């Protein structure tokens, strides 16, 4: 089940009801796998491996008039598993233009509301 491809295309198009179903299913399989990696598995599903981009970096590149809601739902889910400090303070590490965190997109996209 390509859950990573569904959550990237859901946040790109701007649909919020599609996200919460992907948000519910990823919490569900997190309840199924709780052996040794409750923080590490939830991070690796939201974050890719080549770029290192999260679902929040992809949330802020593409802007659309649902994007205030699409962050507020998505921050509370990283708060629900106590991983928001690793989540929000995650750095782009593709080593060509690395270091650009989730905050660095927000000021550049001149969204003074959600910053």
């Amino acid at each position: 089940k390509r859950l990573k491809k569904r959550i990237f295309a859901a946040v790109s198009e701007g649909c919020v009801e599609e996200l919460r179903e992907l948000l519910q299913d990823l919490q569900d399989l997190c309840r199924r796998r709780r052996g040794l990696d409750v923080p590490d598995f939830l991070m690796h599903k939201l974050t890719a491996s080549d770029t290192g981009k999260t679902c929040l970096m992809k949330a802020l590149l593409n802007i659309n008039p649902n994007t205030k809601e699409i962050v507020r739902i998505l921050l509370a889910f990283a708060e629900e598993n106590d991983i928001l400090d690793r989540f929000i303070n995650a750095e782009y590490t593709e080593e060509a233009y690395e270091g650009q965190t989730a905050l660095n997109i927000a000021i550049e996209r001149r969204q003074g509301d959600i910053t």
Binding site: L61, Y97, R109, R110
Partner: protein, 65 residues
């Protein structure tokens, strides 16, 4: 204009297979299917700040990798 009159003359008197590519070739347009129409690249500068809606890639500057 006067050096434009010569370049289109030398290019017309060059009957090779034209290996000299002047352009990004077959780079994608915005469509589900229409990947054609080879392209060009230029640059813009400071004024008129706005949120950027229409874009093609997730902010690289060269080709990725």
């Amino acid at each position: 204009l006067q050096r434009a009159r010569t370049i289109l003359e030398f290019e017309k008197m060059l009957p090779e297979w034209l290996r000299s590519r002047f352009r990004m070739g077959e780079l994608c347009k915005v469509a589900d299917e229409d990947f054609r129409l080879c392209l060009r690249i230029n640059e813009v500068k400071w004024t008129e700040w706005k949120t950027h809606v229409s874009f093609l890639n997730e902010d690289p500057g060269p080709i990725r990798r």
